[PDB]
RNA sequence: UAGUUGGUGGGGUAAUGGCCCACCAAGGCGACGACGGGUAGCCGGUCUGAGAGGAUGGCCGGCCACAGGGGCACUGAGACA
RNA sequence: GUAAUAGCGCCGGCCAACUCCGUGCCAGCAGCCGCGGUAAUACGGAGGGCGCGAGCGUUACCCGGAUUCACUGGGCGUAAAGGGCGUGUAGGCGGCCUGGGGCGUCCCAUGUGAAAGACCACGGCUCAACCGUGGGGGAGCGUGGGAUACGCUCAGGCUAGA
């Protein structure tokens, strides 16, 4: 583009699109469980991914992954969503925070406990 | 004498019936850290023969870097393919501030203080050639004065 | 809290001797004696061609573990030595050698850098009279670094200042083994230090 | 200093007032080339002296009306519609580029 | 039409040198002659001289090159490795005496046009003045 | 009413005032009209009170009304001593 | 687009002024973006960046606006408080 | 006057840190590429290791890397990109010589350009963070004076464009 053109029209600044309408552009959002289904993976992967429809306080109704060996989520259990998709589950854009509200932490988690919200086991 | 740094070695494949058939390519820098650097790209059916071939190739084709107190005489920008390399002289204590490929050369080159920048295509192999060319083009108030005598 | 944990293991990981214990690190036991390979279940296995990162990483870790300093503090010194005029590389080392706790070590009061850190900490040190218990305290040129009177009688201090008889001192220092005093003459230069370090790579590492 | 400006009278259609078209130049803050913008000032002409085509010097004054803070200090050079033309011709292209389109 | 006489000249020169012409003509203009004056003084061109082509005034520009070289492509290194127009119509470029660039770390020059005449960046800085940044040579 | 007073500029437990010429109505730490001195309550250094008596006298020359404590410091730097 | 743009006379103010009023003129603005919709308090600075630039303006300081929402004046040097 | 809180993340590549066991496209991991269907440095534990340390790691958001809106600093034969072609308005740009003007442009002086911050120096709190003092740099605009090569304008001339 000629200098005179740049003067006329000028460059247009690029605009990024969110990948987590956890609305309020908040760090976390709490919602209520609706369905504690279990989806199946995509392309190659196979298994029974534990998922959950959630009615957020942000007005949105979303699907969230439930990390951990085993959970305790039910129909109307209150939960906290943290954002983070799951490559295999098309449609799941947030993870559920374990150890908050109704989602109990993972039992027998002796490692990456910070995630899977499990307290420090007292070594006998 | 010549120190020998290896920039990158890749596996590269080819096709025949029955399957793939690989070769290895190795980019190697060679320098005395005194003002002599050579770049060589050697390919061979085996990693070692490759490095060795490169080493040998680098040793032939050396460049004389007009160092001045561990830094360079002036800034040059050089494009090679879609790779653009930018060199700017620095005071002492600055360090060799550049991405690997560029650095590795600049070090054996004997440089010890520079400001660098890779622009455009960042293909190590092309950024390498780009660097070497940039070094070749360096000139000194001497050479310049010499060039404009007549 | 600066590290505090097995230390002859760092000596080993850097595959180079580190005097993180003053004495012993001589008596055939710095471990770097008949066991200079890195710690752990893999130490004896063959090492692979390190990455440019690995090299710059290892170099910094060395220069740093030598002064038992935290990355946090280490980094700030570096960014300080980067702004100030003069070859960053050496200027950086100058500042590292100006730590009161280092000087004490340099002047023989303490056997190690750790020990010196404590002597400074537990008050057993002086700087132009006024006592200073800040290991990160920056000693300037023209400062007397004496041992605390009350401590001049301390068993520890008498041993070290004893064996210190004869032992020469850095050309940027000087000490009166009598009144257990010493002076910081000038900022040491890169040549003054026989550091198994290549600040070249340390600067480059903070370049990334 | 009460600001003084120079422009052309592109309009004599009002009573005791004239429209002076002051031109201005300067370097683009980012691309540096010298660009040239322009603004119209309504200046007070009591004597109804100044006519269409006159180049005049405008002077910062005390408000005379809303949208009118300048008085015709003086005449620099009379008659020269070559300028009024640009201004009018430009107004003429406006007469389009909407749902139809400006001539040429 | 001939949109930029000055740029036309730098190009004629860039073009001729690339094929190693000895001479090279460019329509004469006071201003263009002023520039050539520097080109010579700074040692970029053997020199130049007024001449008449087809009856009209021109300036012969005597090009200069390095010596013959070794290995393949014995073509001489150019004395004028570079020469780019800067201020151009519809994008004029002026600089204060504090903004006069330092071309090629000093090994190259920059020709300005000041109310004190056409000078090189060093000359300008001396006389402490600025002005339209005609070009850059090195 | 224009005053000559102190302006807190220290920090917690490390107060450092600025003998200032401001309008009575501003925040104490707000925008002043001019600085004319400074005061270190704890004399932490040999130089704990500068005053530029030249300027003060000017301000008083036209209605500047000093806080009591400000006046007491201005007196120390002999802004009033009329010998 | 009609107090809308200018004019003449006048009101009001500490004071200029369509600020307000009577009468007169026909106008004024727009693609150099009027009018309308949306968003927003704005700013020394701050973050980042080799720089150019990008992003930002909560704490602190400067200005503006508001005071449960809307409108209004009184008293005063000063408030529409 | 007593030897006297430690933790958190990570160890397939990017990226510094590897072995055994359990599991068997499951249970799970996942930022991207991807990993798990009986030898898994990629899942879970353990041992060992790397990083950082009243911390460590996650989520959210902004900038850098991104010369990925390119003024610095990009492009349009075939990768995304020449308008289907012309005529021409506004606008952008402008052959050779001389003279006037001095609008752009350049210079000088002067006024303004807050404080805080940024930079350098010295100083205060045991250091530092923080804070104090001093100095330097910094566009823009007002005013007076000056220059006239280039751009503009005016007058005149010529012809290399038309």
Render A58-113 in DSSP notation, one character per residue. Answer: TS-EEEEE--SS-----TT-EEEE-----TTSTT--EEB-TTSTT----TT--SST
Chains that touch E (3 or more CB pairs under 8 A): A, B, D
Domain boundaries, chain B: 3-62, 63-148
**Spacing of B103 CA from H110 C1' in Å:** 52
Nearest-CA distance E2 → chain B (Å): 32
Report how far residue A16's alpha carbon sits from residue F43's, in angstroms, rounded to the nearest whole number.
56
CB contact under 8 A, C91 and B112: no
Residue F55 and residue B47: Cα distance in Å, rounded? 82
The gap between B25 CA and H66 C1' (Å) is 30
For residue C130, give the DSSP letter: S
Distance CA F8, CA C134 (A): 30
Nearest-5° Cα angle at C60, C54 to C63: 140
- Contact at 8 Å (CB) between C109 and C157? yes
Distance, CA of D93 to CA of B19 (rounded, Å) = 70
- State the count of interchain CB pairs (< 8 A) between B and C: 44
Which of B41, B43, B30, B111 has its CA nearest to residue B76? B111
Give how far B74 is from chain E: nearest CA, Å: 6
Task: Report CA torsion sign: C80, C82, C85, C86.
Answer: positive
Residues of E in contact with D30 (CB under 8 A): none
Backbone angles phi, psi at C158, to 5 degrees: -70, -40
- Spatial separation of the C-alpha atoms in residues D96 and F46, rounded to whole Å: 79
Q: Where are the domains of chain C?
A: 1-96+194-208, 97-193
Which B residues, 52 through 81, put their C-beta within 8 Å of a C-beta on chain C?
none
**C-alpha to C-alpha distances, D4 to A84, B105, D56, D70, D73, nearest whole angstrom:** 63, 63, 10, 9, 8
Distance separating alpha carbons of residues F7 and B71, to the nearest angstrom: 51
DSSP 8-class letter at E36: H
Instruction: Quote the tokens at residue B89.
Output: 């002289």
Residue nearest to nucleotide H90 (CA to C1'): D90
For E91, nearest residue in chain D (alpha carbons) = D33
**To probe the interface with D, which of A1, A2, A3, A13 has the most D CB atoms within 10 Å?**
A3
Distances (CA, A) of E52 to A81, C125, E25, E47: 85, 91, 10, 17
Please give the residue of chain D at the shortest CA–CA distance from E88: D33
Give me the residues of D, 28-47, that contact E with CB < 8 A. Answer: 31-34
- Return the SS3 of C59: helix
User: How far is Cα B112 from Cα C202, in angstroms, rounded to an integer?
Assistant: 12
Which value in Å is the resolution of this experimental model? 9.5
Considering the domain E3-80 in this protein, what is its CATH number? 3.30.1370.30
Q: How near does any CA of chain E get to the CA of B9, in Å? A: 31
Query: CB–CB of D33 and E94 under 8 A?
Result: no
N-terminal to C-terminal alpha carbon distance within chain E: 29
Cα–Cα distance, C6 to C117 (Å, whole number): 17
Does residue E14 contact residue E26 with C-beta atoms inside 8 Å? no
CB atoms within 10 A of CB D48: 12
Which residue in C has a C-alpha nearest to residue B94's C-alpha? C88
Backbone φ and ψ for C45, nearest 5 degrees, come out as -65, 155
**Residues 45-84 of D near strand G (Cβ < 7 Å)?**
46, 62-68
Structure tokens at E89: 């119509």
Q: What angle separates helix B100-108 from helix B124-137, to the nearest 10 degrees?
A: 40
Q: How close E90 gets to chain A, by Cα (Å)?
A: 7
Q: How far is the CA of B66 from the C1' of H117 (A)?
A: 42
Q: How far is the CA of B5 from the C1' of H9 (A)?
A: 34
Nucleotides in chain G with any atom closer than 7 Å to protein CB: 5-8, 16-19, 25-32, 50, 52-55, 60-62
Q: Look at chain F and report how many structural domains it folds into.
A: 1
List chain A residues with CB under 8 Å of E91: 3-4
To which CATH superfamily is domain C1-96+194-208 assigned?
Ribosomal protein S4/S9, N-terminal domain (1.10.1050.10)
Class of the CATH domain delimited by B3-62: alpha beta
> Per the CB < 8 Å rule, is A3 touching D33?
yes
CA angle C112, C114, C120 (to 5 degrees): 105
User: Straight-line distance from CA C41 to C1' H41, in Å?
Assistant: 14
Distance from the Cα of D32 to chain A's closest Cα (Å) equals 10
**Distance (Å, whole) CA A94 – CA A86:** 8
Check: CB of residue D10 under 8 Å from CB of residue D54.
no
Decide if F36 contacts F19 (C-beta within 8 A): yes
Strand D70-77 vs strand D34-44: parallel, antiparallel, or unpaired? parallel
For A21, the 3-state DSSP assignment is coil
CB contact under 8 A, E91 and D27: no
Query: Distance, angstroms, CA D19 to C1' G7?
Result: 16
Q: A4 at the E interface (CB within 8 A)?
A: yes
CB contacts < 8 A, A to E, total 4
Q: Is B71:B111 a contact under the CB 8 Å cutoff?
A: yes
Q: Are D27 and E90 inside 8 Å of each other by CB?
A: no
C102 within 8 A of C116, measured Cβ to Cβ:
yes
Q: Which CATH number is C97-193 given?
A: 3.10.290.10
The helix/strand/coil state of D20 is: strand
Do C139 and C98 contact (CB within 8 A), yes or no?
Answer: yes
Is E3 part of the contact surface with chain A (CB cutoff 8 Å)? no
D12: left (phi over 0), alpha (psi -120 to 50) or beta: alpha
The first and second tokens of residue C73, run together, are: 């503090």
Distance from CA(D62) to C1'(G72), angstroms, rounded? 33
F44 contacts: CB under 8 Å, gap ≥ 6: none
User: Chain A closest CA to D57's CA: distance in Å?
Assistant: 30
Gyration radius of chain B's alpha carbons: 17
Cβ(B29)–Cβ(B102) below 8 Å? no
Question: Distance from A42 to chain D by nearest Cα, in Å?
Answer: 50
Question: Is the Cα torsion angle E100, E102, E106, E109 positive or negative in sign?
Answer: negative
Compare all CA atoms of chain D with the CA of A8 and give the residue at the minimum distance: D35
Residues of B in Cβ contact (< 8 Å) with C90: 93
E90 chain-A contacts, CB cut-off 8 A: 3-4
CB F25 under 7 Å to nucleic chain G: no
User: d(Cα A71, Cα A69) in Å, to the nearest integer?
Assistant: 7
- Structural domain spans, chain A: 1-124
With CA atoms as reference, report the closest residue to C22 among C120, C113, C145. Answer: C113
Give the sign of the dihedral formed by CA F35, CA F40, CA F44, CA F45.
Answer: positive
According to DSSP, residue C39 is labeled S
Which chain A positions have a beta carbon within 8 Å of D28's beta carbon? Answer: 7
Burial class (CB in 10 A: 0-12, 13-18, 19+), B16: exposed
Secondary structure (DSSP) of E74-106: -PPPBS-S-EEE-S-SSS--EE-TTS---GGGG
Longest Cα separation, chain F: 40
C-alpha distances out from residue D12 to C156, D16, D53, D65, E60, Å = 102, 9, 9, 17, 57
CB–CB contact A4 D28 (8 Å): no
R_g of chain D, CA atoms, integer Å: 15
CA atoms within 13 A on the CB side of B30: 22
Cβ burial of D63 (10 Å; 0-12, 13-18, 19+) is exposed
Q: Of all helices (H) and strands (E), which one includes residue C119?
A: helix C113-121
Q: C74 in helix, strand or coil? A: helix
Contact C87 B113 (CB under 8 A): yes
What does each C-alpha distance from D89 to A4, A112, D55, D94, F14 come to in angstroms? 21, 75, 19, 9, 71
CATH superfamily ID and name for A1-124: Nucleic acid-binding proteins (2.40.50.140)
Alpha-carbon gap, residue D51 to D74, rounded angstroms:
12
Among F56, F15, F66, residue whose Cα is nearest residue F34: F56
The answer to whether the CB atoms of C81 and B94 lie below 8 A apart is no
Q: Please answer whether residues C99 and C143 qualify as being in contact, where contact means their C-beta atoms are separated by less than 8 angstroms.
A: no
Is the minimum CB–CB distance between E90 and chain A shorter than 8 Å? yes
CATH no. for residue D94? 2.40.50.140
Choose the closest CB to B75 out of E46, E79, E105. E105
Token pair recorded at residue B68: 């001045």
What kind of architecture, by CATH, is found in domain E81-138? 2-Layer Sandwich (3.30)
| D11 CB below 7 A from strand G atoms | yes
Instruction: List the single residue in C87, C206, C207 with the smallest CB-CB distance to B93.
Output: C87
Nucleotide whose C1' lies closest to the alpha carbon of residue D1: H142
**Touch between chain B and chain E (3+ CB pairs, < 8 Å)?**
yes
- H or E element at residue B135: helix B124-137
H-type alpha helices, chain E:
5-18, 30-41, 121-126
Q: Which residues of D74-92 are buried (b: 16+ CB within 10 A; e: fewer)?
A: eeeeeeeeebbeebeeeee
Name the CATH code of domain B63-148 (choices 3.40.50.1820, 3.30.230.10, 3.90.1150.10, 3.55.50.30). Answer: 3.30.230.10
Question: What is the extent of the structural domain holding D40?
Answer: 1-104
CATH number of the domain to which F10 belongs: 3.30.1320.10
- For residues C59-68, b (16+ Cβ closer than 10 Å) or e, as one string? bbbbbbbbbb
């Amino acid at each position: 583009p000629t200098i005179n053109q740049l003067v006329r029209k000028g460059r247009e600044k690029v605009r990024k699109k969110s990948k987590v309408p956890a609305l309020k552009g908040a760090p976390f959002r709490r919602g209520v469980c609706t369905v504690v289904r279990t989806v199946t993976p995509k392309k190659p992967n196979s298994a029974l991914r534990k998922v959950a429809k959630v009615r957020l306080t942000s007005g949105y109704e979303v699907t969230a992954y439930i990390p951990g060996e085993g959970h305790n989520l039910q129909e109307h259990s209150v939960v906290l969503i943290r954002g983070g998709r799951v490559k295999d589950l098309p449609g799941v854009r947030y993870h559920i925070v374990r150890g908050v509200y109704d989602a109990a932490g993972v039992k027998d988690r002796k490692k990456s406990r910070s995630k899977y919200g499990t307290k420090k086991p007292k070594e006998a | 004498d010549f120190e020998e740094k290896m920039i990158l070695i890749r596996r590269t494949a080819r096709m025949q019936a029955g399957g793939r058939r690989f070769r290895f390519g190795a980019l190697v820098v060679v320098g005395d850290r005194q003002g002599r650097v050579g770049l060589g790209f050697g390919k061979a059916p085996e990693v070692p023969l490759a490095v060795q071939k490169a080493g040998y190739y680098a040793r032939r084709n050396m460049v004389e870097v007009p160092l001045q107190n561990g830094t360079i005489p002036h800034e040059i920008e050089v494009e090679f393919g879609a790779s653009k390399i930018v060199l700017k002289p620095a005071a002492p204590g600055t360090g060799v501030i550049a991405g690997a490929v560029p650095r590795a050369i600049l070090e054996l080159a004997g440089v010890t203080d520079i400001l660098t920048k890779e622009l455009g295509s960042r293909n190590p192999i092309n950024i390498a050639y780009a660097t070497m060319e940039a070094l070749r083009q360096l000139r000194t108030k001497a050479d310049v004065e010499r060039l404009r005598k007549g | 809290g600066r590290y505090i944990g097995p230390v002859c293991r760092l000596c080993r990981r850097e595959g180079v001797k580190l005097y993180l214990k003053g004495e012993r690190c001589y008596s055939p036991k710095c471990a770097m004696e008949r066991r200079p390979y890195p710690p752990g279940q893999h130490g004896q296995k063959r090492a692979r061609r390190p990455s440019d990162y690995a090299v710059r990483l290892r170099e910094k870790q060395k220069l740093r573990r030598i002064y038992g300093i935290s990355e946090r503090q280490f980094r700030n010194l570096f960014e300080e030595a980067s702004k100030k005029k003069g070859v960053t590389g050496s200027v950086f080392l100058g500042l590292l050698e100006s730590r009161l706790d280092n000087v004490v070590y340099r002047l023989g009061f303490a056997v190690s850098r750790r020990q010196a850190r404590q002597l400074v900490r537990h008050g057993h040190i002086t700087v132009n009279g006024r006592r200073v218990d800040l290991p990160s305290y920056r000693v300037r040129p023209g400062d007397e670094i004496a041992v605390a009177e009350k401590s001049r009688n301390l068993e520890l201090i008498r041993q070290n200042l004893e064996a210190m008889k004869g032992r020469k001192v850095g050309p940027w220092l000087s000490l009166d083994v009598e009144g257990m005093k010493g002076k910081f003459l000038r900022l040491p230069d890169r040549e003054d230090l026989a550091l198994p370090v290549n600040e070249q790579l340390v600067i480059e590492f903070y370049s990334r | 200093p009460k600001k003084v400006l120079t422009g052309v009278v592109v309009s004599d259609k009002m009573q005791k007032t004239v429209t002076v078209l002051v031109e201005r130049q300067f370097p683009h803050p980012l691309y540096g080339k010298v660009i040239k913008r322009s603004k119209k000032y309504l200046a007070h002409d009591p004597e109804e002296k100044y006519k269409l085509g006159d180049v005049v010097e405008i002077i910062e004054s005390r408000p005379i009306s809303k949208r009118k803070r300048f008085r015709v200090l003086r005449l620099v050079e009379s008659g020269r519609m070559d300028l009024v033309e640009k201004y009018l011709i430009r107004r003429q292209n406006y007469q389009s580029l909407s749902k139809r389109g400006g001539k040429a | 039409m001939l949109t930029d006489p000055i740029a036309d000249m730098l190009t004629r020169i860039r073009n001729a040198t690339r094929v190693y012409k000895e001479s090279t003509d460019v329509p004469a203009s006071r201003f263009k002659e002023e520039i050539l004056r520097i080109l010579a003084r700074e040692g970029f061109i053997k020199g130049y001289e007024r001449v008449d082509v087809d009856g009209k005034p021109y300036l012969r520009v005597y090009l200069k090159y390095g010596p013959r070289r070794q290995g393949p492509d014995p073509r001489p290194e150019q004395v004028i490795h570079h020469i780019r127009r800067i201020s151009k119509p519809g994008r004029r470029v002026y600089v204060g005496v504090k903004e006069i660039p330092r071309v090629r770390r000093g090994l190259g020059i920059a020709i300005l046009s000041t109310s004190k005449g056409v000078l090189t960046d060093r000359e300008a800085r001396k006389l402490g003045v600025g002005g339209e940044l005609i070009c850059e040579v090195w | 009413m224009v005053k000559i007073r102190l302006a807190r500029f220290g920090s917690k437990h490390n107060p450092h005032y600025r003998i200032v010429v401001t309008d009575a109505r501003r925040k104490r730490d707000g925008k002043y009209i001019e600085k004319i001195g400074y005061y270190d309550p704890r004399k932490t250094t040999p130089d704990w009170l500068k005053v530029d008596v030249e300027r003060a006298r000017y301000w008083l020359s036209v209605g500047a009304q000093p806080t009591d404590t400000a006046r007491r410091l201005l007196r120390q730097a002999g802004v009033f001593r009329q010998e």
